[PDB]
Amino acid sequence: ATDTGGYAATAGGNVTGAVSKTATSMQDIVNIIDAARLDANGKKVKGGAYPLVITYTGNEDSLINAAAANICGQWSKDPRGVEIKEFTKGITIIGANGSSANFGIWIKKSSDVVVQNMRIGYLPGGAKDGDMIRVDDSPNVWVDHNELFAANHECDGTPDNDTTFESAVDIKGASNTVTVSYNYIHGVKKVGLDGSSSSDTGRNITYHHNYYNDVNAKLPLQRGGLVHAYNNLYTNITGSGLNVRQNGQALIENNWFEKAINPVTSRYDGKNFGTWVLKGNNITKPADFSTYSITWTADTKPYVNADSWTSTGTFPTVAYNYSPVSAQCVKDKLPGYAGVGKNLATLTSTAC
Numbered sequence: 001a002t003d004t005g006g007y008a009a010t011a012g013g014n015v016t017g018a019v020s021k022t023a024t025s026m027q028d029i030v031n032i033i034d035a036a037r038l039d040a041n042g043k044k045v046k047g048g049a050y051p052l053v054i055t056y057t058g059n060e061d062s063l064i065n066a067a068a069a070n071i072c073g074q075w076s077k078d079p080r081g082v083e084i085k086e087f088t089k090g091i092t093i094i095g096a097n098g099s100s101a102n103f104g105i106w107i108k109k110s111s112d113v114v115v116q117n118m119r120i121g122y123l124p125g126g127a128k129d130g131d132m133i134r135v136d137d138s139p140n141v142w143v144d145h146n147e148l149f150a151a152n153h154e155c156d157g158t159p160d161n162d163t164t165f166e167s168a169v170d171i172k173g174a175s176n177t178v179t180v181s182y183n184y185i186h187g188v189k190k191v192g193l194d195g196s197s198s199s200d201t202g203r204n205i206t207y208h209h210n211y212y213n214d215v216n217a218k219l220p221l222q223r224g225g226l227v228h229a230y231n232n233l234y235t236n237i238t239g240s241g242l243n244v245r246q247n248g249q250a251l252i253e254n255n256w257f258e259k260a261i262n263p264v265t266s267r268y269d270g271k272n273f274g275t276w277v278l279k280g281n282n283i284t285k286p287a288d289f290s291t292y293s294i295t296w297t298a299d300t301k302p303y304v305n306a307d308s309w310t311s312t313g314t315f316p317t318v319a320y321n322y323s324p325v326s327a328q329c330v331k332d333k334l335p336g337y338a339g340v341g342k343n344l345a346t347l348t349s350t351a352c
């Protein structure tokens with residue numbers, strides 16, 4: 001089945017006619033994708049020659065650890081990333097338990113891509129787009145069960161004063177349908193875009209069962225389109241959470257917010273505020289703010305905060321099937337299903 005619990009409906013490379021390959025390193029992944037574009041005669045086949053399931057067994061802990069020991073040395077280095085460009089036959093990159101990477105995965109003009117069980121952290125090249133996961137002009141992409149991390153910190157002297165590290169999951173362009181789920185994202189400043197500029201609006205994105213801890217902003221930075229965020233655990237948000245911009249619409253359901261600043265907002269543009277439909281979150285009314293350490297701040301440009309904690313608009317009927325557990329069960333159970341080494345385990349009501 002292609003059920004991702006979100007707008008994306010894909011099985012990645014786990015489809016009929018697929019070929020399985022094991023990659024012991026980043027270069028092997030690169031070589032495996034290259035080889036998968038050629039037919040029996042060595043001639044290139046558009047979109048790839050056949051579906052692919054790449055099991056990555058490499059471990060770059062030493063690179064991740066050294067980086068964590070000198071974070072301000074990362075931004076100026078060369079970014080590292082496995083590119084998945086114009087591969088539409090269906091592909092899955094799944095890390096084996098114990099695997100890790102100090103390089104990211106950049107999806108571009110592709111479709112039917114799945115990234116699971118990848119432990120990616122402290123990537124070099126924040127000044128040159130060194131993303132952990134990038135989804136550009138790519139619909140039906142599922143980013144599931146990964147651990148994306150760095151340090152939620154800004155070193156001095158970086159370009160635009162914000163490139164110490166790049167994103168956990170940036171989504172831009174015509175990535176019309178994407179599902180980001182069960183990811184353990186921690187120590188990340190600019191978590192993930194959903195449109196890279198004011199003009200890059202649209203897409204239908206679903207963020208579910210993700211565990212965010214000690215993150216600054218962009219959960220996501222939404223521009224137009226639809227965003228369905230449900231069953232997420234947002235703890236220690238130091239800047240802002242869901243920022244609904246350029247008339248985007250969000251459905252924020254059954255999430256747990258705690259020790260968070262500006263959890264639901266629409267800021268930094270000064271106009272075209274998006275809307276949100278709130279329901280079943282641990283926060284039900286403004287009186288719950290103190291209980292969950294929820295604070296609010298202003299901005300120099302006109303903005304809208306969910307400080308009345310009420311819906312500011314509507315949201316279309318959710319297309320796909322999903323069954324959210326309670327916000328309490330998220331708080332209680334999510335940490336055991338989110339991230340890597342969980343065998344892609346999902347949280348259901350029976351496990352609450």
Ligand SMILES: O=C(O)[C@H]1O[C@H](O[C@@H]2[C@H](O)[C@@H](O)[C@@H](O[C@@H]3[C@H](O)[C@@H](O)[C@@H](O[C@@H]4[C@H](O)[C@@H](O)[C@@H](O)O[C@@H]4C(=O)O)O[C@@H]3C(=O)O)O[C@@H]2C(=O)O)[C@H](O)[C@@H](O)[C@H]1O
Pocket residue numbers: 129160161162170172190193195196197216217218221239268
């Ligand atoms: O695809 C990409 O990676 C993408 O990266 C850049 O675009 C990102 C945003 O789309 C862009 O709007 C901008 O974000 C600004 C600001 O530059 C960023 O530092 C952050 O700043 C806010 C606030 O405005 C600041 O005054 C201060 O208080 O810090 C805030 C914060 O959130 O920490 O967010 C801003 C915003 O939300 O608009 O830059 C982004 C980035 O990743 O730096 C490139 O511009 C784009 O071309 C593309 O490469």
Ligand SMILES: [Ca+2]
Pocket residue numbers: 129130131134166167170
């Ligand atoms: Ca980026």
Ligand SMILES: [Ca+2]
Pocket residue numbers: 160162
């Ligand atoms: Ca910037």
Ligand SMILES: [Ca+2]
Pocket residue numbers: 166167
């Ligand atoms: Ca950026």
Ligand SMILES: [Ca+2]
Pocket residue numbers: 217218221243268
């Ligand atoms: Ca921002």
